[PDB]
Design a protein around this motif. Structure first.
Motif, PDB file in Angstrom:
ATOM      1  N   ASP A 137      -1.025 -57.110  29.315  1.00  4.10           N
ATOM      2  CA  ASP A 137      -1.273 -56.419  29.612  1.00  4.10           C
ATOM      3  C   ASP A 137      -1.189 -55.906  31.698  1.00  4.10           C
ATOM      4  OD1 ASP A 137      -3.476 -54.596  31.185  1.00  4.10           O
ATOM      5  OD2 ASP A 137      -5.099 -56.016  30.945  1.00  4.10           O
ATOM      6  N   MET A 138      -1.157 -57.297  32.325  1.00  6.83           N
ATOM      7  CA  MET A 138      -0.772 -57.519  33.359  1.00  6.83           C
ATOM      8  C   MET A 138       0.899 -56.665  33.659  1.00  6.83           C
ATOM      9  SD  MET A 138      -0.890 -60.327  35.457  1.00  6.83           S
ATOM     10  CE  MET A 138      -0.331 -60.068  36.941  1.00  6.83           C
ATOM     11  N   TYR A 139       1.802 -57.079  32.444  1.00  2.75           N
ATOM     12  CA  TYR A 139       3.131 -56.495  32.746  1.00  2.75           C
ATOM     13  C   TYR A 139       3.020 -54.871  32.345  1.00  2.75           C
ATOM     14  CZ  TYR A 139       4.788 -61.910  31.250  1.00  2.75           C
ATOM     15  OH  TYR A 139       4.649 -62.323  31.481  1.00  2.75           O
ATOM     16  N   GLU A 180       0.868 -52.791  32.656  1.00  5.14           N
ATOM     17  CA  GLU A 180       0.038 -51.903  33.882  1.00  5.14           C
ATOM     18  C   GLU A 180       1.074 -51.689  35.394  1.00  5.14           C
ATOM     19  OE1 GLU A 180      -2.741 -50.485  33.977  1.00  5.14           O
ATOM     20  OE2 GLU A 180      -3.279 -51.204  32.271  1.00  5.14           O
ATOM     21  N   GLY A 181       1.775 -53.143  35.058  1.00  4.65           N
ATOM     22  CA  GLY A 181       3.052 -53.254  36.245  1.00  4.65           C
ATOM     23  C   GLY A 181       3.841 -51.981  35.940  1.00  4.65           C
ATOM     24  N   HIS A 198      -4.350 -49.309  23.766  1.00  2.00           N
ATOM     25  CA  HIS A 198      -4.970 -50.650  24.045  1.00  2.00           C
ATOM     26  C   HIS A 198      -5.622 -50.776  22.643  1.00  2.00           C
ATOM     27  CE1 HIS A 198      -5.942 -51.465  28.431  1.00  2.00           C
ATOM     28  NE2 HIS A 198      -4.246 -51.405  27.912  1.00  2.00           N
ATOM     29  N   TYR A 199      -6.302 -49.432  22.539  1.00  5.75           N
ATOM     30  CA  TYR A 199      -6.553 -49.368  20.936  1.00  5.75           C
ATOM     31  C   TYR A 199      -5.378 -49.653  19.866  1.00  5.75           C
ATOM     32  CZ  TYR A 199      -9.128 -47.730  16.564  1.00  5.75           C
ATOM     33  OH  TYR A 199      -9.129 -47.792  15.663  1.00  5.75           O
ATOM     34  N   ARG A 211      -4.399 -45.664  28.615  1.00  4.66           N
ATOM     35  CA  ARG A 211      -4.261 -47.124  28.278  1.00  4.66           C
ATOM     36  C   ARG A 211      -5.240 -47.733  27.468  1.00  4.66           C
ATOM     37  NH1 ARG A 211      -3.187 -45.600  33.500  1.00  4.66           N
ATOM     38  NH2 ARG A 211      -1.781 -46.522  35.145  1.00  4.66           N
ATOM     39  N   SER A 212      -6.140 -47.146  27.466  1.00  6.00           N
ATOM     40  CA  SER A 212      -7.298 -47.306  26.155  1.00  6.00           C
ATOM     41  C   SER A 212      -6.409 -46.841  25.346  1.00  6.00           C
ATOM     42  CB  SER A 212      -8.378 -46.155  26.791  1.00  6.00           C
ATOM     43  OG  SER A 212      -8.972 -46.423  27.975  1.00  6.00           O
ATOM     44  N   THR A 246     -13.232 -50.207  22.500  1.00  5.80           N
ATOM     45  CA  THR A 246     -12.414 -49.445  22.718  1.00  5.80           C
ATOM     46  C   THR A 246     -13.247 -48.884  24.310  1.00  5.80           C
ATOM     47  OG1 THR A 246     -11.637 -49.194  20.787  1.00  5.80           O
ATOM     48  CG2 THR A 246     -11.935 -47.073  21.613  1.00  5.80           C
ATOM     49  N   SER A 285      -5.838 -54.763  35.078  1.00  3.05           N
ATOM     50  CA  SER A 285      -5.656 -56.988  34.265  1.00  3.05           C
ATOM     51  C   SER A 285      -6.802 -57.328  34.665  1.00  3.05           C
ATOM     52  CB  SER A 285      -4.234 -57.041  34.305  1.00  3.05           C
ATOM     53  OG  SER A 285      -3.212 -55.638  33.405  1.00  3.05           O
ATOM     54  N   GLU A 310     -11.325 -46.937  32.734  1.00  3.08           N
ATOM     55  CA  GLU A 310     -11.127 -46.036  32.930  1.00  3.08           C
ATOM     56  C   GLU A 310     -10.486 -44.982  33.434  1.00  3.08           C
ATOM     57  OE1 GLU A 310      -7.429 -46.671  33.241  1.00  3.08           O
ATOM     58  OE2 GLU A 310      -7.982 -49.120  32.809  1.00  3.08           O
ATOM     59  N   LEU A 314     -14.814 -54.327  18.103  1.00  2.00           N
ATOM     60  CA  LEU A 314     -13.841 -53.318  18.527  1.00  2.00           C
ATOM     61  C   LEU A 314     -14.060 -51.751  18.745  1.00  2.00           C
ATOM     62  CD1 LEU A 314     -10.645 -52.533  19.262  1.00  2.00           C
ATOM     63  CD2 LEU A 314     -10.334 -52.073  16.856  1.00  2.00           C
ATOM     64  N   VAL A 337      -2.505 -60.366  38.465  1.00  2.96           N
ATOM     65  CA  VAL A 337      -2.216 -58.857  39.866  1.00  2.96           C
ATOM     66  C   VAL A 337      -2.931 -57.688  38.870  1.00  2.96           C
ATOM     67  CG1 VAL A 337      -1.034 -60.350  41.411  1.00  2.96           C
ATOM     68  CG2 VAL A 337      -0.209 -58.984  39.666  1.00  2.96           C
ATOM     69  N   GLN A 338      -2.471 -56.513  38.938  1.00  3.61           N
ATOM     70  CA  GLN A 338      -3.472 -55.279  38.958  1.00  3.61           C
ATOM     71  C   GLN A 338      -4.362 -55.342  38.408  1.00  3.61           C
ATOM     72  OE1 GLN A 338       0.853 -54.387  38.405  1.00  3.61           O
ATOM     73  NE2 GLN A 338      -0.587 -52.749  38.347  1.00  3.61           N
ATOM     74  N   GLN A 377     -10.330 -33.903  30.136  1.00  2.00           N
ATOM     75  CA  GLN A 377      -8.535 -33.931  29.864  1.00  2.00           C
ATOM     76  C   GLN A 377      -7.211 -34.597  28.514  1.00  2.00           C
ATOM     77  OE1 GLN A 377      -9.278 -37.697  32.678  1.00  2.00           O
ATOM     78  NE2 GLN A 377      -8.328 -36.254  34.072  1.00  2.00           N
ATOM     79  N   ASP A 393       3.156 -48.787  36.828  1.00  2.81           N
ATOM     80  CA  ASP A 393       2.929 -47.585  38.001  1.00  2.81           C
ATOM     81  C   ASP A 393       4.395 -47.369  38.249  1.00  2.81           C
ATOM     82  OD1 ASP A 393       0.607 -48.557  38.254  1.00  2.81           O
ATOM     83  OD2 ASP A 393       0.580 -50.527  39.588  1.00  2.81           O
ATOM     84  N   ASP A 422     -14.081 -49.495  27.680  1.00  2.37           N
ATOM     85  CA  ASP A 422     -12.557 -49.775  28.384  1.00  2.37           C
ATOM     86  C   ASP A 422     -12.090 -48.315  28.498  1.00  2.37           C
ATOM     87  OD1 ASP A 422      -9.478 -49.500  28.248  1.00  2.37           O
ATOM     88  OD2 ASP A 422      -9.202 -50.695  26.951  1.00  2.37           O
ATOM     89  N   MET A 423     -12.047 -46.733  27.705  1.00  2.00           N
ATOM     90  CA  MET A 423     -12.422 -45.789  27.670  1.00  2.00           C
ATOM     91  C   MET A 423     -13.067 -45.369  29.186  1.00  2.00           C
ATOM     92  SD  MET A 423     -11.830 -43.479  24.674  1.00  2.00           S
ATOM     93  CE  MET A 423     -12.588 -42.214  25.306  1.00  2.00           C
ATOM     94  N   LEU A 458       2.999 -61.262  41.291  1.00  2.00           N
ATOM     95  CA  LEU A 458       4.049 -61.105  40.514  1.00  2.00           C
ATOM     96  C   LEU A 458       4.959 -59.758  40.220  1.00  2.00           C
ATOM     97  CD1 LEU A 458       4.802 -61.675  37.259  1.00  2.00           C
ATOM     98  CD2 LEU A 458       3.245 -60.929  36.467  1.00  2.00           C
ATOM     99  N   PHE A 459       4.141 -58.448  41.072  1.00  2.00           N
ATOM    100  CA  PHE A 459       5.368 -57.330  41.252  1.00  2.00           C
ATOM    101  C   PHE A 459       5.006 -57.046  42.767  1.00  2.00           C
ATOM    102  CE2 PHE A 459       3.512 -56.469  36.638  1.00  2.00           C
ATOM    103  CZ  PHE A 459       5.333 -56.840  36.235  1.00  2.00           C
ATOM    104  N   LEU A 511     -10.043 -40.248  20.610  1.00  2.00           N
ATOM    105  CA  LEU A 511     -10.195 -41.209  21.909  1.00  2.00           C
ATOM    106  C   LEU A 511      -9.475 -40.971  23.595  1.00  2.00           C
ATOM    107  CD1 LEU A 511      -8.720 -44.749  20.278  1.00  2.00           C
ATOM    108  CD2 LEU A 511     -11.290 -43.671  20.659  1.00  2.00           C
ATOM    109  N   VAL A 512      -9.219 -40.843  24.606  1.00  2.00           N
ATOM    110  CA  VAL A 512      -8.675 -40.112  25.905  1.00  2.00           C
ATOM    111  C   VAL A 512      -8.301 -41.481  26.786  1.00  2.00           C
ATOM    112  CG1 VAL A 512     -10.348 -38.363  25.880  1.00  2.00           C
ATOM    113  CG2 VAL A 512     -10.939 -39.923  27.118  1.00  2.00           C
ATOM    114  N   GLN A 513      -7.689 -41.414  27.924  1.00  2.00           N
ATOM    115  CA  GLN A 513      -7.174 -42.455  28.489  1.00  2.00           C
ATOM    116  C   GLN A 513      -6.124 -42.817  27.782  1.00  2.00           C
ATOM    117  OE1 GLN A 513      -8.711 -42.737  31.568  1.00  2.00           O
ATOM    118  NE2 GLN A 513      -9.833 -40.701  32.074  1.00  2.00           N
ATOM    119  N   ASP A 573      -3.920 -53.462  19.262  1.00  2.00           N
ATOM    120  CA  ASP A 573      -4.802 -54.310  19.151  1.00  2.00           C
ATOM    121  C   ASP A 573      -5.168 -53.739  17.758  1.00  2.00           C
ATOM    122  OD1 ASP A 573      -5.958 -56.206  20.816  1.00  2.00           O
ATOM    123  OD2 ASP A 573      -7.502 -54.930  21.088  1.00  2.00           O
TER     124      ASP A 573
END
Ligand code: BOB
Ligand code: BOB
Lengths: 219, 221
Positions: A91-93, A95-96, A71-72, A67-68, B89, B69, B96, B85, B65-66, A52, A99, B92-93, B50-51, A63-65, A75
């Protein structure tokens, strides 16, 4: 090196990555998918971890995804706070907010009847579920950033999402004066300001050619 | 409280990944089940969400939440997010991608009964074409027991969860993936995980009619 982004020529899911790269001051290239055969070629050669896109070639990695990827980058460019407490909040903010952004990402591909329904759903969610949280944060601590009084990934994604929402519902921030003012200040940060000007790699709202293309590519 | 408290209905849903990672890390936790609309309203009306949504986990004095996270946080507190890292990384991938596969299972109980059959087939194809071959090659590639580095990560826990949940519906799904079979046996024999798999853990069963009915009753106006 220098990041190369693989996606069709349009916003979709890759637009968040463009925002965060531009916001970090990172120039990048794009290799656009126009055809179903180009996608197959990219899948044929082991360049896509899970077959994908989005995919970004960066720092010698593929890199894929979404969100990942975010994040990379965050950082690498001090957009993920200074400690675990701040990182968790960011992270929470994010992800929210993703959505909410999801409703804008799927919008172009809904039947017209359902597209109108989805703009109403967007308005309700923004006004009742998401915006009051960020409005309260900003009203409470007074600062121009959601977390740690420096630009973070949460600010960038929230700005993208707000600005994208305002294209569909021009007055959506009217009950949110702290967010109005937040959006303006964020929009004046030199990198963001340039990204918003003509000629950046910021992508426009999706037109009939992008919609037909993605149908042609992903069916 | 150092004892996490998990807010969710009595069932797997999205929260089961959190239960998996906590058990894998050797963290005892408590659960507060959502059984009605009124209990959800209370959680929402009181600003504990939170949401306005669950999963929500009370942990180290915070209300996280989430799902993604929450998992990241737990992984950083318990050395499940690698040692640098590069590893982080990759983890993480992998998480996901695996969560995109696990999503098919999470949503499966809520499809029309005619569509469920079609979705098991499609679930099988995605797993065998898109995901399993990537992980089989990694595990052939370094012959290491773990996906990343040489220690348990968040990616191993979520992969195991996902493989085992698929196998419940497609028991032979790993037949063409010998390295994955071996990996599933190794992980399932890590003592924390092995205890989680035993009766008496807070591992939840496959979703039944009580569960599905409850979630419609809670989350549907
Ligand atoms: C319904 C018609 C359009 C569907 C495609 C849309 O979902 C998106 C385009 C938006 O303009 S993206 C194309 C898709 N990618 C992902 O879904 C990545 C998800 C991952 N969770 C992420 O965030 O990275 C894809 O590459 N599909 C290759 C294939 O399966 O062959
Ligand atoms: C199909 C009928 C309903 C299905 C609901 C399912 O999605 C899940 C239950 C699985 O058994 S979860 C309940 C939902 N939570 C989220 O969607 C969190 C997503 C966030 N991305 C995450 O990952 O944390 C919810 O709390 N909704 C409150 C409301 O809006 O009132």
């Amino acid at each position: 090196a220098r990041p190369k982004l693989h996606y069709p020529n349009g916003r979709g899911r890759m637009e968040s990555v463009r925002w965060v790269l531009a916001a970090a001051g990172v120039e990048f290239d794009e290799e656009f998918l126009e055809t179903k055969e180009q996608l197959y070629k990219l899948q044929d050669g082991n360049h896509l971890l899970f077959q994908q896109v989005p995919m970004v070639e960066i720092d010698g990695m593929k890199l894929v995804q979404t969100r990942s990827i975010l994040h990379y980058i965050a950082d690498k460019h001090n957009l993920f706070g200074k400690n675990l407490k701040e990182r968790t909040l960011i992270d929470m903010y994010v992800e929210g907010t993703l959505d909410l952004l999801e409703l804008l990402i799927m919008h172009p591909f809904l039947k017209p009847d359902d597209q109108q329904k989805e703009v109403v759903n967007m308005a309700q969610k923004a006004i009742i579920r998401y915006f009051p949280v960020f409005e309260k944060i900003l009203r409470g601590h007074g600062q121009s950033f959601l977390v740690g009084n420096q630009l973070s990934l949460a600010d960038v994604i929230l700005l993208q999402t707000i600005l994208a929402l305002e294209e569909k519902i021009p007055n959506i921030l009217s009950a949110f004066p702290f967010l109005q003012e937040y959006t303006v200040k964020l929009s004046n940060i030199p990198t963001i300001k340039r990204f918003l000007e003509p000629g950046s790699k910021k992508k426009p709202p999706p037109d009939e050619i992008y919609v037909r293309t993605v149908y042609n590519i992903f069916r």
